[PDB]
Structures are given as C-alpha cells and as structure tokens.
Amino acid sequence: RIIVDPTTGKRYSRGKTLGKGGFAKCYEMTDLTNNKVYAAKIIPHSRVSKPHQREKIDKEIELHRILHHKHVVQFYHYFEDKENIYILLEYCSRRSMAHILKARKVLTEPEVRYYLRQIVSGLKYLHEQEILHRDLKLGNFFINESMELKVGDFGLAARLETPNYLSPEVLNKQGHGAESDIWALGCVMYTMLLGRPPFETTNLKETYRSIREARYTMPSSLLAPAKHLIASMLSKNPEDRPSLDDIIRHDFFTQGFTPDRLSSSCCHTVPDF
Numbered sequence: 197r198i199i200v201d202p203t204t205g206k207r208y209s210r211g212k213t214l215g216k217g218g219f220a221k222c223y224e225m226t227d228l229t230n231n232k233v234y235a236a237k238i239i240p241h242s243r244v245s246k247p248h249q250r251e252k253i254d255k256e257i258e259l260h261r262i263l264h265h266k267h268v269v270q271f272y273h274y275f276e277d278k279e280n281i282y283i284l285l286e287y288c289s290r291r292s293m294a295h296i297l298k299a300r301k302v303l304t305e306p307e308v309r310y311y312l313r314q315i316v317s318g319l320k321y322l323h324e325q326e327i328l329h330r331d332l333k334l335g336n337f338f339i340n341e342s343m344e345l346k347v348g349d350f351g352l353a354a355r356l357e358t359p360n361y362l363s364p365e366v367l368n369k370q371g372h373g374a375e376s377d378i379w380a381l382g383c384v385m386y387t388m389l390l391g392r393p394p395f396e397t398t399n400l401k402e403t404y405r406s407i408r409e410a411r412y413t414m415p416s417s418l419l420a421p422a423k424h425l426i427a428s429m430l431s432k433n434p435e436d437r438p439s440l441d442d443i444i445r446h447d448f449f450t451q452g453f454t455p456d457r458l459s460s461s462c463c464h465t466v467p468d469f
C-alpha cells in the first residue's frame with residue numbers, strides 16, 4: 197500500500213500494524229525519499245467528525261512540530277488525504293516502559309535512575325519551551341533500539357498560563373502547572389521501583405480525597421535516598437516540590453553505578469550485579 201501526499205509530491209509505503217492509539221490506528225510508514233521507517237498515526241476523518249476532536253488533533257500537531265530534543269519523540273511530518281490524517285513520528289522499536297515493566301514488575305535502582313535521567317532531560321526541554329506534558333506515564337516513555345528513552349504523546353499537552361496521575365492542585369480546581377508534571381514524575385518513580393502507583397489511578401471521585409492531602413504508604417523495601425526523593429516530588433502543595441535541576445542532583449542519582457547503556461535484555465531479564 198503506497199500512500200501519496202496530495203500536497204507535495206510525494207510517496208510513502210505503509211508496513212506492519214503497530215497497534216491502536218487510541219483512538220487512532222497505527223502503522224509503520226517508510227518515507228521513500230529518504231528511505232526510512234517511521235511510527236505513524238493514521239487517523240481517518242470518520243472518527244474526527246465533531247469540531248472538538250478536530251481541534252485536539254490540530255493542537256497536538258501544532259505543539260509537537262517545533263519540538264527538537266534527543267529525549268523527546270521526534271515529529272517528522274504530518275499530511276492528509278481523502279481518507280486519513282498522517283502523523284509520522286520517530287520509530288521506537290523496543291516499544292515503551294509500560295511494556296517492559298509488565299515483564300519485569302519492578303526495576304533495579306541503577307535502571308530507574310537510567311530512565312529518569314532521560315525523562316527529566318526531555319521534560320526540562322519541554323518546560324523551557326513553556327509546554328506542559330500533562331500526561332506523563334510509563335506508556336508514554338518510548339524506547340528505541342539503542343535503549344534510549346523518548347517522551348511522547350503530546351495529545352494532552354498545552355503551553356503555560358484524562359491523565360494517569362492527577363495532582364492535588366488539579367483536583368483543587370486550580371489547573372495544571374509545571375509542578376503537576378513533577379507530581380506525575382514521583383508517581384512514575386514509585387511505580388518503577390515498587391510496581392503499583394502511590395495513589396489510585398481510576399480518576400474516580402472516591403480517590404480524590406486520597407489525593408488532596410497526599411496520603412500514601414511508603415514501603416520499607418525502598419532505600420532511604422529513593423524514599424526521600426519520592427516524598428519530595430509527591431509533596432501536597434506544588435511549591436514544596438523540587439526543581440528539575442534539584443531532582444537529578446539528589447543523592448539517589450549521585451550515589452550508585454548507573455549506565456548508559458542498558459542491554460535490552462533488561463526488557464525481560466534482571467541485570468547483573
């Protein structure tokens with residue numbers, strides 16, 4: 197199946213099905229210029245009828261376009277034909293962290309700070325570009341062949357003024373800031389090390405009081421530096437939370453081995469030491 201760009205020329209070849217978004221259908225797409233495979237969202241016009249989703253797809257593109265960073269999924273090109281919206285994105289062959297953590301359950305400390313270093317790197321560029329992610333989760337940390345991490349899915353992204361990790365300040369109807377991303381970051385780290393989030397992720401009104409409030413159990417299994425860092429990122433009030441610069445300079449990062457580079461065997465098997 198060859199896909200021609202009606203505006204510009206211009207030929208692409210679609211390969212294997214990668215999965216679903218949602219709500220989009222995803223495929224491999226080789227730019228024939230060029231000769232290179234991309235992970236691509238193929239969004240038919242048939243699901244984007246309401247003048248409500250059309251704006252949300254347009255926004256994601258608008259925001260993702262101008263992002264250029266080694267730990268941010270690279271936007272390549274978008275176009276559309278008769279059928280379908282085409283968003284061509286950086287191919288990450290090892291899928292995501294949600295995948296690897298399903299196989300592993302829990303990660304070792306050197307692995308955790310290997311992934312977090314890359315996340316904070318990507319999120320920092322994001323936050324300097326005045327853009328907020330608003331949907332940080334393991335499923336949105338894409339991993340390439342070289343075991344490198346890219347932050348992806350700017351579907352919920354917006355610039356400064358339903359997600360996995362609701363912050364207390366968002367639940368106090370004060371909207372989403374940069375510190376609300378740092379909230380998600382602590383949840384991410386907690387899950388990497390323990391394999392269950394610190395709070396319920398149902399987004400139901402019953403877990404709201406639980407996340408005001410920031411009441412959660414800190415397991416004994418966690419080492420002190422890991423414990424002290426998580427507690428900081430998950431502080432009740434947003435102002436008490438550490439800066440992104442503060443996070444990567446914490447004792448958790450300065451003490452301990454740490455790669456790069458990780459072997460991909462770490463996707464399924466637990467690494468030596």
Ligand SMILES: CC[C@@H]1C(=O)N(C)c2cnc(Nc3ccc(C(=O)NC4CCN(C)CC4)cc3OC)nc2N1C1CCCC1
Nearest residue numbers: 213214215216217222235236237269285286287288289348
């Ligand atoms: C474009 C959306 C998002 C994204 O933004 N980027 C950048 C991305 C970059 N790279 C990938 N890579 C792969 C993702 C999944 C698979 C895979 O194993 N899929 C299987 C196919 C056979 N099957 C029936 C079971 C599922 C392989 C990948 O590369 C080898 N996926 C990406 N996605 C995903 C696309 C579907 C949701 C998320």
